[PDB]
Design a protein around this nucleic acid. Structure first.
Lengths: 84, 134, 126, 52, 51, 182
RNA sequence: AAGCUCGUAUCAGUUUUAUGAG
RNA sequence: CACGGACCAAGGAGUCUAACGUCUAUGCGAGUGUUUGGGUGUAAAACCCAUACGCGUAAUGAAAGUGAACGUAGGUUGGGGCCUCGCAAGAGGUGCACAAUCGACCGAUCCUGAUGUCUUCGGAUGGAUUUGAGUAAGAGCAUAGCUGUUGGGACCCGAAAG
RNA sequence: GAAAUUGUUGAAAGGGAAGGGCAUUUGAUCAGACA
RNA sequence: CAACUUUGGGGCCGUUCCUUGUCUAUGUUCCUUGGAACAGGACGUCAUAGAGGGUGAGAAUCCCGUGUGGCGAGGAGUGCGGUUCUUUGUAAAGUGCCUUCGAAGAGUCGAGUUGUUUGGGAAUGCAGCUCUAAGUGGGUGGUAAAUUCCAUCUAAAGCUAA
């Protein structure tokens, strides 16, 4: 119960966008309208950093994040929201 | 050594019947490698990530060489942009058969490749990794 | 075909339900058709049998013969019409077991219940 | 509707029809094409005359 | 093009109507698969048998 | 794990199929007995325990007393009308309070209730109500939002929260032992 | 046996040249 | 000369299952698995299916916990095959997989201990002949077959006993 | 209505062995083709 | 204090459920063989009936039955649909606002010790023996043990479909 922390690398991280707004947010640097992503609603509890990702600023919502992960997201200009 | 395959997939046997004939007649070392790959089992025909295709396509003079994979093909979300080339292989998954046309390239069969470049001309082969196996 | 859940499609069942059936069911199992004359007369194809009926035979070695029942042996699923017998060697004679599927009636012995029966089965008797 | 096409997706959940591996189930037609046959040094006789 | 299909009627005649194929009959034929399926799918209408 | 004599105790669910047909027949029988009613009680939405599953919701047992009272009726009429009740459950969340109340309001709007006296109009029943009032997992955000930053880097927060929690008793001890000086 | 690499390939229950230990 | 064998027919002995493992064929392929169950049906079949669960995709430490690109996902060497030159022989480029070696990154052990700081917290930087079956442009899931291993009466019959 | 086993007839053989193998003789028996 | 709203009991008859009883198509035509036609050939017919059995050998069409519908009979029965006679009722119930109280199970809970049992480990459960309580209390929170909080629950009395 306590030990549900199934990881998500920064690699995958757009398949959550089902297929279609993937393009619409890909061709956008929009700091005003950025896509929100729900790790928890997709069933992932902690972010880990493996990948390299575009610089498109995109929002992410999750509980647990590592340093390279948040650094890369802030490098794209996205942001983490530490929901419970 | 092997002489003919274990499978019963009829089209696979048909491709073998073709590429045996070209390896008999035309003698280019491409066809023998094709055939010796086709005979093999599913472990030793591991799949080929389209990302790996792009890696090997970033080689020098490697922009229009029609890549060949006797095995299967797997889409990869880990990259976002991809070239437009002509790619031949046995089994294209639906995801990568979408991706490649999305890029604009064509996902071709093997017999059509035998029409287009029989002798192994302007081509390349990949054989996916096998010590990610257990 | 069978589209139900309480009737059998099995040999081991129905041979038993034929052999070990009561006389009240053998009355019906030993049915018989009628002549087409009587069919046109009464408006019915077939019937059970009776001691006092005249009949003609249509199959077997005894084809062409006819007569009146003397007895109905339900315990062998058979009927004994007289003037159809076989001489023993010793001058005595035997009745002949026949199935009433292989007979045809030309005259009956009606009763009140038989008129009611034909009315019950689409009577055109008179 | 039920089994899918290139235009209707499948009318089933997450299903596609299968994929051919090959353009056509024939090989005589393929090899009797011309661009292949240009690339073929010729054949023998296929019944060798006995010597000695 | 899904080339053509003709139509008959309950008494039968090649009517003026016609149709295309569904692009399903173009699918392959894998009798190895029919074999390994059918001999795993006819066995599901089985009852036990045991002394 | 067969060192014991398991061979006498084995269960073999051949009768999966037959149970299914008996079950469907029982459904239909109960419904034809219960002819106008929907065969199921309206069950609420509830948000689960055990943080693994807390994102979800779940069709719980029974709505509450208080939510029913907020709809402005009583349990006694609810269980006739086709609505469940739990009583040992207690509402301490307002969105859920509001959602269950909304379900009740929809239900009362969506039904028609006969008299006790009769005249029994034609009703043309439905088989189930879970279909028409489906349990619905709610929205948390629309897909699009603007970015804002706070310069905290979202890892140091967790780390020093951890540190404060594990050293809370000792920092309290420091505070108390300097407080009780002289 | 299944793969991977070689292919005229490293070799030999073997001699000869050379040189040891014994 | 250890044993069994008078004669004939009929019976008569490596199977069935659960869980693991290899090899192969197949489906799908960063996904995979319809069948606990619901619907439907010409009814134990076949056909469809919701949502959850499993396995795998991230490992590692005693654990608290942490957690995978410096580089065109590195360099060097060998490397099938392709391309260029050459009639050829051979030369050059590219060099998949695989192997070796050197490095890097992650996790852990030891040392340093920066900006700051509830003044006792925190962990920037860089090192160790340390180590993991890791990372280094994913590959497995499921079913069937062959046979294997263990336990189930277990190739069959046959032991006194409790 | 098989086999062991048993009888009658027909054929054959036979000095302390029988059965089997290679070839052939004697006797019985036998299928195929000549157009 | 305030206004509001709503009820019951019988029979009758259908209907549903069970037990059933009964009725509901089409060749016995021609030829051959054979002891016998249910076999072979021809010509036909019915089909929400070609499942099955029988009769002098494989019978849709010879019979019983099957299928499809209907017709009655006897029962259980309130399951509801119409009916019909009664009128409860100055009864009973629900509804908000103010106030006062709100009783809540003992040889039991719990603790020790003995024996057994559990996956339950520094002691889960059970039974015996001993000691034996409290009511802003008491149990429980899988690691001991003192203290203080927090959360959830109300025991020692009880019934009931699928």
């Amino acid at each position: 119960a306590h030990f549900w922390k199934p990881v998500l690398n920064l690699d995958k991280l757009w398949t959550l966008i089902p297929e279609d707004k993937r393009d619409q947010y890909l061709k956008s640097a929009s700091k005003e309208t950025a896509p929100v992503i729900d790790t928890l609603a997709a069933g992932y509890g902690k972010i880990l950093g493996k990948g390299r990702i575009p610089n498109v600023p995109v929002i992410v919502k999750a509980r647990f994040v590592s340093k390279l992960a948040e650094e890369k997201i802030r490098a794209a200009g996205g942001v983490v929201e530490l929901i419970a | 050594h092997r002489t003919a395959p274990k499978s019963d997939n009829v089209y696979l046997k048909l491709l073998v019947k073709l590429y045996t004939f070209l390896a008999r007649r035309t003698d280019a070392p491409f066809n023998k490698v094709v055939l010796k790959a086709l005979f093999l089992s599913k472990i030793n025909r591991p799949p080929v990530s389209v990302s790996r295709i792009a890696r090997a396509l970033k080689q020098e003079g490697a922009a229009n060489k029609t890549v060949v994979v006797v095995g299967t093909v797997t889409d990869d979300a880990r990259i976002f942009e991809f070239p437009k080339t002509t790619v031949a292989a046995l089994r294209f998954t639906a995801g990568a058969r979408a991706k490649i046309v999305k890029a604009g390239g064509e996902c071709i069969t093997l017999d059509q490749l035998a029409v287009r470049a029989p002798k192994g001309q302007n081509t390349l082969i990949l054989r996916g990794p096998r010590n990610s196996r257990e | 075909a069978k589209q139900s859940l309480d009737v059998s499609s099995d040999r081991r069942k129905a041979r038993k339900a034929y052999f070990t059936a009561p006389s009240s069911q053998r009355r019906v199992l030993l049915s018989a058709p009628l002549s087409k004359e009587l069919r046109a007369q009464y408006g019915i194809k077939a019937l059970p049998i009776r001691r006092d009926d005249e009949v003609l035979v249509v199959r077997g070695s005894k084809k062409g013969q006819e007569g009146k029942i003397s007895s109905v042996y339900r315990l062998k699923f058979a009927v004994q019409v007289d003037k159809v017998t076989k001489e023993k060697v010793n001058g005595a004679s035997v009745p002949i077991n026949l199935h009433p599927s292989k007979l045809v009636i030309t005259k009956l012995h009606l009763d009140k219940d038989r008129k009611a029966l034909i009315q019950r089965k689409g009577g055109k008797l008179e | 509707q039920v089994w899918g096409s290139e235009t209707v997706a499948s009318s089933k959940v997450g299903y596609t029809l299968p994929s051919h591996i090959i353009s056509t189930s024939d090989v005589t037609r393929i090899i009797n094409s011309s661009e292949i046959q240009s690339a073929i040094r010729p054949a023998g006789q296929a019944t060798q005359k006995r010597t000695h | 093009s899904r080339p053509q299909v003709t139509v008959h009627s309950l008494t039968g005649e090649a009517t003026a109507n016609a149709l295309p194929l569904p692009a399903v009959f173009s699918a392959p034929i894998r009798p190895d698969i029919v074999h390994t399926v059918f001999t795993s799918v006819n066995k599901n209408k089985r009852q036990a048998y045991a002394v | 794990h067969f060192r014991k004599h398991w061979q006498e105790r084995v269960k073999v669910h051949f009768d999966q199929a037959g149970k299914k047909v008996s079950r469907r027949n029982a459904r239909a029988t109960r419904a034809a007995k219960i002819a106008p009613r929907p065969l199921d009680l309206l069950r609420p939405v509830v948000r689960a325990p055990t943080v693994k599953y807390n994102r979800k919701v779940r069709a719980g047992r029974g709505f509450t007393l208080a939510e029913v009272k907020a709809a402005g009726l009583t349990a006694a009429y609810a269980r006739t009308i086709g609505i469940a009740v739990d009583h040992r459950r207690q509402n301490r969340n307002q969105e859920i309070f509001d959602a269950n109340v909304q379900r009740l309001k929809e239900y009362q709007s969506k039904i028609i209730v006969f008299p006790r006296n009769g005249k029994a109009p034609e009703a043309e029943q439905v088989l189930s109500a879970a279909a028409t009032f489906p349990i619905a997992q709610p929205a948390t955000d629309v897909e699009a939002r603007a970015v804002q930053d706070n310069g905290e880097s979202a890892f140091r927060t967790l780390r020093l929260a951890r540190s404060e929690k594990k050293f809370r008793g000792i920092r309290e001890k420091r505070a108390r032992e300097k407080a009780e000086a002289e």
